[PDB]
Amino acid sequence: DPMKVTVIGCYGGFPAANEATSGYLFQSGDYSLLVDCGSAVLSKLFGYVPAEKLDAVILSHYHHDHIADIGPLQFAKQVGSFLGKGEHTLPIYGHDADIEQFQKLTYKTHTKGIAFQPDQPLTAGPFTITFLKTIHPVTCYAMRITDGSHTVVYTADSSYQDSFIPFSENADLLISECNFYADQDGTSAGHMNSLEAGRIAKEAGAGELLLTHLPHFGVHDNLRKEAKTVFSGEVNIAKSGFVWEG
């Protein structure tokens, strides 16, 4: 069983015309895990896997562009249930330090909020997930996701920190946010530029780098060239439908 990541949405903040914000489909065997659930994510996701075949959701943080589709997903589960597309409760994992956001993850018997613990690995079917707190204006967690043979790291949202490097060590794929260009500083917004994403990939010895949480200006391909001045492996710009597999 190979591990397969499909980018569902990849824009920062809000979606470009016909595109989506943060959502990533992680699949192994029959298991389907959705990582983040932003704007237009469900619409796109259902082109790949129907609501009832989704096994779990995990959320890095509670910014609109990572959670806007949660309530629609809750409605999908409720209707699925009244349609007899199987009555199974959908677990949604998040941090519980923000009480009100976490409470909203639970909807009748249809979805169920489950607190992940930052200092302890989570098992979600065939996946193990470990966490790193990021530098972002709200509590937020990057994720090291493995199936035992391959490892994919998702930075979620963050400004640069050296701790990404031991955390991303030997990842087959690093999905790094890259909201800014080489000549810009994303510190005040809690974001990274392409040189920073390139630095993490190189220093961790990542096999491959995918740049995501994309900006709404500039030439995105410039983000690729800029990262490539630092990191020598494969680099790509995320888009809806982009697939990685190992």
Q: Site residues (CB under 8 A) for its own copies?
A: 13-21, 38-40, 42-44, 46-47, 50-51, 64-65, 68-69, 71-76, 78-79, 83, 216-217
Per the CB < 8 A criterion, the answer to whether 235 and 228 are in contact is yes
SS (H, E, C) the chain: CCEEEEEEECECCCCCCCCCECEEEEEECCEEEEECCCCCHHHHHCCCCCHHHCCEEECCCCCHHHHCCHHHHHHHHHHHHHHCCCCCCEEEEECCCCHHHHHCCCECCCEEEEECCCCCCEEECCEEEEEEECECCCCCEEEEEECCCCEEEECCCCECCCCHHHHHCCCCEEEEECCECCCCCCHHHCCCEHHHHHHHHHHHCCCEEEEECECCCCCHHHHHHHHHCCCCCEEEECCCCCEEEC
Binding partner at 40 among Zn ion, its own copies, none, C-beta below 5 to 8 Å by kind: its own copies
* Residue 55 marked in a binding site: yes
Residue 191 interacting with Zn ion (CB under 5 A): no
Residue 65 interacting with Zn ion (CB under 5 A): yes
In the complex, minimum distance from the CB of residue 110 to its own copies, in angstroms, rounded to a whole number: 11
Size of the site for Zn ion (CB under 5 A): 3
Residue 44 interacting with Zn ion (CB under 5 A): no
Binding partner at 97 among Zn ion, its own copies, none, C-beta below 5 to 8 Å by kind: none
* Residue 66 marked in a binding site: yes
Per the CB < 8 A criterion, the answer to whether 31 and 125 are in contact is yes
In the complex, minimum distance from the CB of residue 64 to Zn ion, in angstroms, rounded to a whole number: 8
- Rounded to whole angstroms, the maximal C-alpha distance in the chain is 54
- Using the minimum distance from each CB to its own copies, give the nearer residue, 69 or 177: 69
- Using the minimum distance from each CB to its own copies, give the nearer residue, 15 or 198: 15
Binding partner at 20 among its own copies, Zn ion, none, C-beta below 5 to 8 Å by kind: its own copies
In the complex, minimum distance from the CB of residue 84 to its own copies, in angstroms, rounded to a whole number: 10
Residue 63 interacting with Zn ion (CB under 5 A): yes
Binding partner at 68 among Zn ion, its own copies, none, C-beta below 5 to 8 Å by kind: its own copies
Residue 95 interacting with Zn ion (CB under 5 A): no
Give the interface with Zn ion as residue ranges (CB under 5 A).
Answer: 63, 65, 157
Annotated binding site for Ca(2+): 30, 53, 55
